[PDB]
Amino acid sequence: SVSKANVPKIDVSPLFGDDQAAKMRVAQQIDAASRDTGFFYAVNHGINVQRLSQKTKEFHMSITPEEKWDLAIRAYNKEHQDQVRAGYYLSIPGKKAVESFCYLNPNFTPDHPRIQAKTPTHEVNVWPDETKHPGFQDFAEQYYWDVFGLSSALLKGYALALGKEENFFARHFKPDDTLASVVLIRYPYLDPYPEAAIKTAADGTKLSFEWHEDVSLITVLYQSNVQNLQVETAAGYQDIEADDTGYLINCGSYMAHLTNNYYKAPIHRVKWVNAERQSLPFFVNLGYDSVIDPFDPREPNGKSDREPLSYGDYLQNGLVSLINKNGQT
């Protein structure tokens, strides 16, 4: 009885080029999707997602329990007090099925000014031993830059869609300072699948991750071809079809803040599925001190009754709140 959500496939390739008319026609499609269910698939995006999937699989299936402790975030290993965001997020057999590896901007090096200053939300990535995972760090860092590139193009489309100049968001999304993250999530097949690792929604649906708005400007997501996501709409939660050739795009709550809820952050959740699969989000985050002045594209003077919020304030508050609401991942 759970209807397919309207999730259009938008050819985003004009956003990489210089045909302004064509870009406006893509922006209209982004506007439409953003006003409807809040999701679309970006197609013709130029990223080799099959290779991303293969390299990620090789990592997930070769990492050992020893390596996971050695890379673990603070929530799992008290010795790693600097690792709030970046590192390994362990499963707990019998209790918690999902496990993952998160990394941040590769430019956050020991000498980076924000690392020196110890500013919250900035960390130096941790990586497994190169000889045990040959090529993995290099692949993963290049992937960061490939999806950064796609996200910059998408941000040009969102800006045009909102009646702005195309750099309105992108000017704040910079290699030297972006707080964006990649998460390489493994969802396992388990037989038996422990009930303790399954949540139940109010409507009785079995879930792996509860309802939420994303903490992002936008989210740029690759998933395996196994249906799992649902979006809350007015006729109920609806199934978002999988498409392992496309990137699933949606707004996060910073976009809702900037646009005075004209582009809402859609509410969505992750169904429980007993399948070995991947979920690989890129969270498009700005710089720590990036402030965009809020506006309202439904009002004649564009004025909004929201206050400016720096991205760093937003992000630290949001990530902590999401862990309190929906649990440590």
Ligand SMILES: N[C@@H](CCCC(=O)N[C@@H](CS)C(=O)NCC(=O)O)C(=O)O
């Ligand atoms: N550690 C990350 C933030 C992770 C936020 C989070 O928990 N996201 C969920 C909800 S959007 C997710 O990615 N879910 C994916 C899925 O498949 O469940 C970072 O420091 O930036």
Ligand SMILES: [Fe+2]
């Ligand atoms: Fe999400």
